[PDB]
């Protein structure tokens, strides 16, 4: 396990092995490792036992019976964000508090996920959709639950931050997790594209982000990229993620069919095209986003983009075409 | 007769004759109805607009829902109570009938605006969003510091539909329920003052490019146009106190100050900074009302008056007279 954690600063860490080796505690192990690596416990005077207590409770609140949106996905997004934070184009740009916010946001961003979509929750008149007025239903809930867990016994990892730091961190984390709602994707992308075209860099080629709006925008898209990073990973990892999302989707589709509902796109196990669906996912969502991130940090993300394009060509390879 | 049983009734009927008028004496209605102004006024309006027949709402279902809704406005909150809800409902009802908007809205849009008005402050605790945020309340935790109370009012207002014999929308189609739900959410979220400046700016833009028939009736083109007018309409109703007959306005001022001072007392007790205009020891009630009109209420109503010109001219005139009252009573 210690050997596998040597790759914690590398894209494509084998998170599934981490999960197996840690007794299904990938989120706790990876968060702890990253907090030590970034010296965050010292910087913010976080008691190690408080950190571990919070992380284990947090991890407990990801559902074991949800195939994709579980603690392994959370650990993956945390670790991917951790790698992106260290991209050369962003060297010394973000404060320790901003870094803490991005990583914490990643860790909680899907907590207590039920394995069905916002639209399903809206369409089925769920209590969650009633609570949140059909608006970013799950993302609001992830935030509420993630913060609420800080209240459990010896779980307040932010106990030694100043009031101002707490308030700032809370705002940033909320802004980041709400940006993981796919209903915001096109607007986020449109604005990121415009940021890229007017971007400013130092002599060494480091990005200049002069206000909160530009800074939080980059953190939002960073964690969104991490959330949408599966197709950019080594193929053996990507195939496992594809298996899991389809299992989750098909279970939702089964519930829709039981309820006499129209079956959502890609949720029908009898009429599904896995390869077609991943190529569409890459072409219409993942590549447009990642090519824009790559533009922002050029050339830092070229290897990531190369893998994505290779994986796209792979998934397309068994689909007959004119 | 009037859906609550009162003593008297004939006197209540005389007051309800003004349900179509600005400056209905809603405090009188509240007293005459045994503190059921929201139930009585909503009942009257639904009957007047024939909404029970249109949407096949059983009258007993309507009264049951209204009574339940009214019960969830706090009796010990001086301003944000069932009288305020009744007032905003009745004010929206008048604004909907303004000549410039004749035949513009569907019955479902009318139902949405009235329903939104009725629930728009339900279960209000008598403290602000910012107070709830500053004190780390469960509500602010639930709603991530964003439109905290307004999200709550919606959730409660909708949830009460699920109580026994309370679903006034049971005979709407699936599509109608979905449309009404979206409109009601859009309207109540627009009552968040954090959205006021943007909302007014966009209303100004709409006024600059407004289209009218030769009889000065507004032409709205799409959902965006219609919901924008409905959002500003209910926001105007929410902010209509200073445009009312002075005796009504004077009572609303007394009540909001009572509520604000109570929040300031909670702040002082916890050693927090006391919020603007919430410090009973250092208040200028009259000066604050003039400020309120100059910076919030007049800019809004002047723009609404433009939109429906000349429908709201008298409302505007009353506002200016009332500003002068509070000006004239600054110590
Ligand atoms: C490996 O496969 C995927 C991995 C991740 C996603 C995916 C889509 C959107 N996100 C972002 C988070 C989100 O908001 N979601 C989660 C999915 O459901 C909708 C709300 N993530 C999709 C994947 O593929 C789907 C299965 C058929 C092709 C599409
Ligand atoms: C008659 O007096 C008032 C009547 C209504 C308001 C008022 C302000 C904003 N709204 C819109 C609803 C809202 O969002 N609120 C409610 C008040 O607290 C802020 C969140 N309503 C203010 C009044 O005066 C205050 C006392 C000092 C001057 C201001
Ligand atoms: Mg999510
Ligand atoms: Mg492309
Ligand atoms: Mg190289
Ligand atoms: Mg309100
Ligand atoms: Mg138009
Ligand atoms: Zn996710
Ligand atoms: Zn109100």
From Swiss-Prot, chain B:
Domain called PDEase: residue spans: 4-331
- Residue numbers binding Zn(2+) 1: 84, 120-121, 238
Kindly list the places in or outside the cell where this protein is found, as annotated in its UniProt entry. Answer: Apical cell membrane; Cytoplasm; Membrane; Cytoplasm, Cytoskeleton
Task: Name the residues that bind AMP.
Answer: 80, 121, 238, 241, 289, 292
What outcome follows a substitution of residue 121 to N? Decreased 3',5'-cyclic-AMP phosphodiesterase activity. Loss of Mg2(+)-binding
Residues joined by cross-link Glycyl lysine isopeptide (Lys-Gly) (interchain with G-Cter in SUMO): 5
Provide the record's note on post-translational modification. Answer: Long isoforms that share a conserved PKA phosphorylation site in the N-terminus are activated by PKA through phosphorylation. Isoform 3 and isoform 7 are activated by phosphorylation (in vitro), but not isoform 6.
Identify the residues that bind Zn(2+) 2: 121
* Positions bound to Mn(2+): 121
**Where are the active-site residues found?**
80 (proton donor)
Tissues in which the protein is found: Expressed in colonic epithelial cells (at protein level). Widespread; most abundant in skeletal muscle.
Question: Which amino acids does the record list as binding Mg(2+)?
Answer: 121
Residues that bind 3',5'-cyclic AMP: 80, 289, 292
Query: So what family is this one in?
Result: Belongs to the cyclic nucleotide phosphodiesterase family. PDE4 subfamily.
Q: How does it assemble?
A: Homodimer for the long isoforms. Isoforms with truncated N-termini are monomeric. Isoform 3 is part of a ternary complex containing PRKAR2A, PRKAR2B and AKAP9. Interacts with PDE4DIP. Identified in a complex composed of RYR1, PDE4D, PKA, FKBP1A and protein phosphatase 1 (PP1). Isoform 5, isoform N3 and isoform 12 bind RACK1 via their unique N-terminus. Binds ARRB2. Interacts (via N-terminal region) with SHANK2 (via proline-rich region); the interaction is increased in a PKA-dependent manner.
What's this protein's function? Hydrolyzes the second messenger cAMP, which is a key regulator of many important physiological processes.
* Disease note: Genetic variations in PDE4D might be associated with susceptibility to stroke. PubMed:17006457 states that association with stroke has to be considered with caution. Acrodysostosis 2, with or without hormone resistance: A pleiotropic disorder characterized by skeletal, endocrine, and neurological abnormalities. Skeletal features include brachycephaly, midface hypoplasia with a small upturned nose, brachydactyly, and lumbar spinal stenosis. Endocrine abnormalities include hypothyroidism and hypogonadism in males and irregular menses in females. Developmental disability is a common finding but is variable in severity and can be associated with significant behavioral problems.
Name the UniProt record assigns to this protein: 3',5'-cyclic-AMP phosphodiesterase 4D
Q: Which organism is it from?
A: Homo sapiens (Human)
Query: Gene encoding this polypeptide?
Result: PDE4D
